[PDB]
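User: Hi! Is it possible to get a structure for several chains at once, not just one? Here's what I have:
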Amino acid sequence: SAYTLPDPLVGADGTRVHDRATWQHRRRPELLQLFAREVYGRTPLGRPEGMVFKVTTMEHAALGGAATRKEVTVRFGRDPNAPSMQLLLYVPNAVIARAERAPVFLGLNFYGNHTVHTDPAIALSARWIPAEAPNGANHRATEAARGSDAQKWPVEQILARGYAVATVYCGDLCPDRPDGLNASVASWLAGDQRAPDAWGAIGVWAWGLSRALDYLETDPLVDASRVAVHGHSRLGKAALWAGAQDDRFALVISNESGCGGAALSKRIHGETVARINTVFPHWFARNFRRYDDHEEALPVDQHELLALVAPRPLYVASAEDDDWADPRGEFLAVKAAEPVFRLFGQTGPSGEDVPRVNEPSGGALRYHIRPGPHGMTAQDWAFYLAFADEWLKSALP
Ligand SMILES: [Au+]
Ligand SMILES: [Au+]
Ligand SMILES: [Ca+2]
Ligand SMILES: [Mg+2]
Ligand SMILES: [Mg+2]
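Assistant: Yes, the chains can be modeled jointly so their relative placement is included. Here is the combined structure:
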């Protein structure tokens, strides 16, 4: 292909990065600043002062006794009028009963907390939902929407394997529509047009994931040092940017995150910078639009975003028929990030070409491609659970 990638291990001034300390204290900040200014926009603050956590419901015998279910309003200021998000948490009762804290999978959902499981006790979101959401009515959730996205969320299996499940609807943070930033937590945090380097939806979604982690640190049922942050597609772009910016996340999973997630942009294949910015002008910074039809001018590529997770375990995965996300570009980004993981003594996929379907490859830096179209399937999750068992931080040292 007709591109050349910037080297993560060459600093902005030309000096080679030879050691883990130089990586962590000099090169990581350089790369975080480039992604903030040129791609996602600047995250203007981390935890806001005055965050308030309210447990609104608590069920100790959910899912027929298998789980404790908690709903938590995370309000971003002390005034009752301040914006908030609604977190849903299922915790495996087997782990609670042993008086042990559970590790956690955390990720955003597309259409509302009530869509991840049929469970009729989940609060029905009252927020705007996209027309694509199954069983909506005038952009609001209906009772028939309950469990409408459960295929992406094997809650019972995740719990049986010893992990809690935490989720938040992405639209609590920024509604996924081209004008959504004006009704987002970003609008709350003197003029009206956002600045060239202002964050978009991906940055806002990623920030919400870190705010969910702030909540998890206070919950006695879970171990917030053992959180795997995950996402599918656009929500996987957010998971990657969250895990790169916030090194408290212990493990990061990108399920088919594609353009502006794991796929190289300088490889012109499937979705391009111009296409993503034209269709989704709210997702990235306005500055990213400088690279429409000009990916050769990008000063970073997505292999460097993957490298910002090192040395923490990172899983990138693709679907065989998902040409728009550019599976080969996702794999080649993993290979181009591998030298940074190797600096930290980790290993990535063995081969130099895309592995065969359903044969994951790599150590703490892992890749698989599964048959079929864009989505997030039981096979994806089976592989993610094996990876978390092996590579997620232990309850011990
Ligand atoms: Au992109
Ligand atoms: Au692209
Ligand atoms: Ca592409
Ligand atoms: Mg029940
Ligand atoms: Mg700690």
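The pocket of gold ion (ligand 1) is lined by residues 259-260, 265, 273, 276 (CB under 6 Å). The chain has ten helices and eleven strands.

User: Great, thank you!
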